[PDB]
Amino acid sequence: PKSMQCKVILLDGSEYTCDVEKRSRGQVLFDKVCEHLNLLEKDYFGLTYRDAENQKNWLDPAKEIKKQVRSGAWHFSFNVKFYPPDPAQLSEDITRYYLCLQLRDDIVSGRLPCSFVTLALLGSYTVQSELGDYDPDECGSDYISEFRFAPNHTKELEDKVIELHKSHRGMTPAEAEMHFLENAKKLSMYGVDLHHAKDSEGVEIMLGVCASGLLIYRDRLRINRFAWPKVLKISYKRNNFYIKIRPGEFEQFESTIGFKLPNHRAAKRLWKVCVEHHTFFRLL
Ligand SMILES: CCNc1ccc(C#N)cn1
């Protein structure tokens, strides 16, 4: 029974290696990674691979791994797929821990924009969780943390992390991670999966997929939002993505909105993440 080696980048940046039978479905690998992680609340997470166009794809747990990675290496990342709007409602502290690690990467990468003060506050909770109580012995006037807190580090940011860290004495790691999440969950781009597209006029927009629905970012001042309940059908055809927007009260007809994606695979990927978010956040 022939087995393929799998390499998974975990959220702490380390590498997990395991073997699965070469005809395995994605769920098989996902279950192995989740067991390694002692993760029970698995519904929020998934595995990502890079396609031949170097695009991030979700590994479909129902489909064969070989029919997804195709010509590429069996290399994956472990990621948050569905960002919970209220992390306090997760049953386990370890779930909240993996969610914090994902968000720290969302912040450092610049996917999740964040004010100076919130970067410093999130940083201070991470430091409290991981080192415990502030100690002056480790931190002089010239201290720079090993921890990555932001897309661009400044001395002023390091200083503010320490000032806030001092305020958190006696805080336990679960408590500090819960405070991290209470702040992160409020950020306007929390759990927003962005897709480059063009509107029906050819104007360049971003489509955001998240818990609260589909967001259209047009020109900073013009941001349209379609709550999942207002979306009856999600479709794609060639390079085009379509949503059916339910009739308003006393309107005779459903309204259709049309977008141009860079290519046919980008249109299918956007369709599938929308359907998955619609299902997930209809049930949650
Ligand atoms: C960890 C991020 N992984 C992702 C994100 C978006 C999509 C899509 N579409 C696939 N994988």
UniProtKB/Swiss-Prot annotation:
One of its GO terms (cellular component) is cell junction. One of its GO terms (biological process) is myelin maintenance. Residues 4-284 form the FERM domain. It is found in: Cytoplasm, Cytoskeleton; Cell junction; Cell membrane; Cytoplasm. It comes from the Eukaryota. Interacts (via FERM domain) with CADM1. Interacts (via FERM domain) with PRMT3; the interaction is direct and inhibits the protein-arginine N-methyltransferase activity of PRMT3. Interacts with PRMT5. Interacts with PRMT6. Tumor suppressor that inhibits cell proliferation and promotes apoptosis. Modulates the activity of protein arginine N-methyltransferases, including PRMT3 and PRMT5. This is Band 4.1-like protein 3. It comes from Homo sapiens. The lineage of its organism: Eukaryota, Metazoa, Chordata, Craniata, Vertebrata.
